[PDB]
Amino acid sequence: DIQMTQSPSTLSASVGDRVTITCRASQSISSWLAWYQQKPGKAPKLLIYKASSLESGVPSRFSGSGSGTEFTLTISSLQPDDFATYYCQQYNSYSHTFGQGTKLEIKR
Amino acid sequence: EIVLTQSPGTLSLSPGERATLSCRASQSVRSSYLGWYQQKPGQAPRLLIYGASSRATGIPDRFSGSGSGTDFTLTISRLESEDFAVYYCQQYDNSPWTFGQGTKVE
Amino acid sequence: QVQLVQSGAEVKKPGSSVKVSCKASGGTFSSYSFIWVRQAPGQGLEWMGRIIPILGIANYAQKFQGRVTITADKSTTTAYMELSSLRSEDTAVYYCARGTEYGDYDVSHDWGQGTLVTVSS
Amino acid sequence: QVQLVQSGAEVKKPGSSVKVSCKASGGTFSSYSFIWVRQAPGQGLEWMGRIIPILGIANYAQKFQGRVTITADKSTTTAYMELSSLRSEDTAVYYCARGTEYGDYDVSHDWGQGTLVTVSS
Amino acid sequence: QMQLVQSGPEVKKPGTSVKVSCKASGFTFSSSAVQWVRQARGQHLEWIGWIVVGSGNTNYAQKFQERVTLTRDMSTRTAYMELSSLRSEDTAVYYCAAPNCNSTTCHDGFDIWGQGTVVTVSS
Amino acid sequence: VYAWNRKRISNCVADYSVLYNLAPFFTFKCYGVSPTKLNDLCFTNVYADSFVIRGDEVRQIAPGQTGNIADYNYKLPDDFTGCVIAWNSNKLDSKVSGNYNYLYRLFRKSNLKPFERDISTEIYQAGNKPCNGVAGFNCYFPLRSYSFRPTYGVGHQPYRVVVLSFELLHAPATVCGPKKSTNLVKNKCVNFNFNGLK
Amino acid sequence: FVIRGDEVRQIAPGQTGNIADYNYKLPDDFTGCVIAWNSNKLDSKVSGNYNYLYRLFRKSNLKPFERDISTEIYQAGNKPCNGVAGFNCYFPLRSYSFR
Amino acid sequence: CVNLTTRTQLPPAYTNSFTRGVYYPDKVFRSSVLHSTQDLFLPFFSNVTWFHVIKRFDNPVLPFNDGVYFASIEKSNIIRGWIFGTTLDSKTQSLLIVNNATNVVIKVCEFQFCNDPFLDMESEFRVYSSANNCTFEYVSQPFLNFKNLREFVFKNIDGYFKIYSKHTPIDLPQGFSALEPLVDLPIGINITRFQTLLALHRSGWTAGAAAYYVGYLQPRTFLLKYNENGTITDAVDCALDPLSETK
Ligand SMILES: *[C@@H]1O[C@H](CO)[C@@H](O)[C@H](O)[C@H]1NC(C)=O
Ligand SMILES: *[C@@H]1O[C@H](CO)[C@@H](O)[C@H](O)[C@H]1NC(C)=O
Ligand SMILES: *[C@@H]1O[C@H](CO)[C@@H](O)[C@H](O)[C@H]1NC(C)=O
Incomplete structure (x- = not known):
């Protein structure tokens, strides 16, 4: 199985701030990975598939970049609705593993 | 999932008469997905009746099935020395295919 | 685009099995593939099974052999999972x-x- | 005019891969194609595959597919074959x-x- | 000529594996199908499984689905069984x-049958 | 392959020289036009069709060819002019488990007229008994999926294909390539060209 | 020589194309005859005949009745190739893979 | 689409073309040279149809022939654009030109034109319902006591659409004015009939005083006089008068 972790596990951001989340796998998995956004209490929503393509209805300010074993999701301008959990998922070979889950929060 | 009860187990008729064979299914099966097979002792089975009413190529005209709703029947209109063998029937529905116990004619 | 309804909340003893349904309404149904994914409160996400009803290829998680089976119905455009x-x-x-x-x-x-x-x- | 030299005899265990080289000297190396054949101790020849380094096309025997890799180098004008x-x-x-x-x-x-x-x- | 020629009897030991196949010729084998059954001496026929030559989709019996495999090849137009x-x-x-076909319409149901292979497992 | 995309190309300047860098080795068969002389004359409309097929089947995309993809999925006319470009893409469209996103039609009652699309998914009745939508006997699902895997050989690895078609109508040509230029010189008896003015 | 089926019309005075420019040039004031007949039965392999080549890239057009058998690399951009088949670095010879 | 039944049916009036409708035949520059050219021109002193809009609502569907000379004495820019095509429906390819206050849009597209197309601050476009399968799109700078006289010449030659325009501030005035090339289009369609569009100021709607004239082109030979700056200053029709033929 492909064991991956995403860093940081928790990041503090503010409105209008530029932040990025990195996600690295164990070995090469080509570009077979998708990004998932989950507000606490509801089902996660897909944002990026093929690690670069933008799903219909997803705002274009979401940006994904990656070739293999290291993928980065970049946010240019942040909005208060962005504070949620982001999940990785690879689908190269069977037994599709997920990421741990990163938390984005406002500074207290 | 599909059981085709067969009766009687043994048959004893002399040539020149008419014998009866029946494969009774335990559930509802479509007529276009069942077949009847007869094999001589030690020989491979051959297809006799497919669709419960249509003969195959080379099948003698003496054979004529009934093709009821869920209880298929095959009535032999004329018996010959070749017809003395064992008979089996199979179901072709979505359920795993099963065979009958086998009818022996003397 | 497509509206989905699942089953309801269920409480059951461990010594049994639970059947969960999922009904799809919207667009063509023969061009859809169905997956089941787990969400435990104490940890993150984990995948269970993946199936194409129209092509008939089923693939479960490596740690769930003989435990959960997923089948779909074409007439009702529904899917059901049972886990023992x-x-x-x-x-x-x-x-x-x-x-x-x-x-x-x-x-x-x-x-x-x-x-x-x-x-x- | 042109002569080919090949490596020495090899003895090895069943669970490994064997490396053999083939060096050719003379002529223009760009108009050359390399082909490999096996000779059983009690039987005749048996074709394996053909490589055209200049055109970059490769083809192997049907029963050697996935096991034989034939490569060539322009720098040293040698042919390398790997069998696993x-x-x-x-x-x-x-x-x-x-x-x-x-x-x-x-x-x-x-x-x-x-x-x-x-x-x- | 429309015919199904099968391999010969083989003898093995418990815990080993067997490989049996039958060759097809005399008909359009691109759109046919094959099923395998077994029958002991003096016993009734038992269905094992089936596979589509042009698709490869296979369906197994519930009892033997953990120890049966079905493979087919286009070039050699042969149906293979491996039993462990x-x-x-x-x-x-x-x-x-296999049913009969004429590249336009295929026969309804399995009409022709192979010669059969007798396999004995003993030590 | 069965649902091959169709794109219209018109009112543009096209440089075909860039296409030579797609891969070190890739087929560039051109029918009726010399590929090196595509930057001089120009056409009225250009059609581009893109899809993915098995590498071995790449020989079935050609005028006068027969097979399975040729007559059931994509047919080219006998009097066809244009080019076909196919390169290996095993690095981009391969899954270790196996990809299933690519489908090809397998059974059809008749052949395909050149440049025709067939997206029907209704079950194929091989025999005479109407199964009415069940995959039993004499009824197989016409669509089959390529199980692309990087462990496959070169004869089964995915190959991306892009087919260009050209033609002439009474409408003026607009899809013409670049024309280049040269620095200007003054006060010297020289040969000049100004928009086709010798 | 041996050429492709549709290129037989390129063997004529004043014609333009790949063959008429990089492989064989006929003079404008040509006199004589040309004979071309199909030979699919003697120059075709099921696997593919690769012994028949043709030049694709050249610096400049050939003057009439000139032969050019050089196999050097072709430098199509500004960066010099230095004998490698890299980006904008093409081998000028291809093959008539006859079948 | 909104059908209008407040039309006032009157026969179209007529007027004299005088010496209007001369355009630069080509791109070459000449000075102090009398040049004779054979091309499609509007004959001197010919009938030109007259249309009024005021409650006069004159929006007929006129033929195209080999060309049209379109002129309009107007103010406040009531006329906005024109429609071109053969059957004026989605079954055949059609061309559309509109000049709203924003910009100019040219679309050659399979519109389903309304029976009475027009425009209604004006942001109500009841001109067509659908645009199905279509290929060409172009955008450019807008073309824009009666004080506005706008003259246009439309030609469709071998798949090319040529538009000539001239705007002069002021019946058809007496004088001379050459028309300069404006837009060339490689449309490549067939055109046999055309229609204009109006902008109605809602108030239901109030239409101001405006009039436009339509003349048709047929081939003949003119003699054009270029002054020393390359501008056409006068012309002579070579098939009107025996004296002109002698000239
Ligand atoms: C315009 O037409 C009217 C009637 O058709 C005619 O009397 C008049 O002479 C025409 N104009 C000229 C300049 O001939
Ligand atoms: C218009 O021109 C097209 C060709 O451009 C022709 O096919 C069509 O018949 C023409 N229409 C009429 C009414 O003549
Ligand atoms: C031509 O242009 C010059 C300056 O551009 C001007 O002085 C002269 O009057 C013009 N000629 C005419 C006839 O208007």
């Missing part, structure tokens, strides 16, 4: 997710409301 | 053969002395 | 049946 030998740690919520031929089967573009199944004594 | 998943009956002599542009690529014009490969316990 | 975990009760004659 319920364990105490198997108390969580089940989400039903969909794949599209225009896109990728493995990914899940849309998600359902979810079914919360719990086990206790 | 060895078994019992492959004990034979490996011939390196060559094809010129004026003649047919598929046909073998010049041959090396050959190397004996043996596998045992 | 042999037992003393596996001594039966195996048959392969």
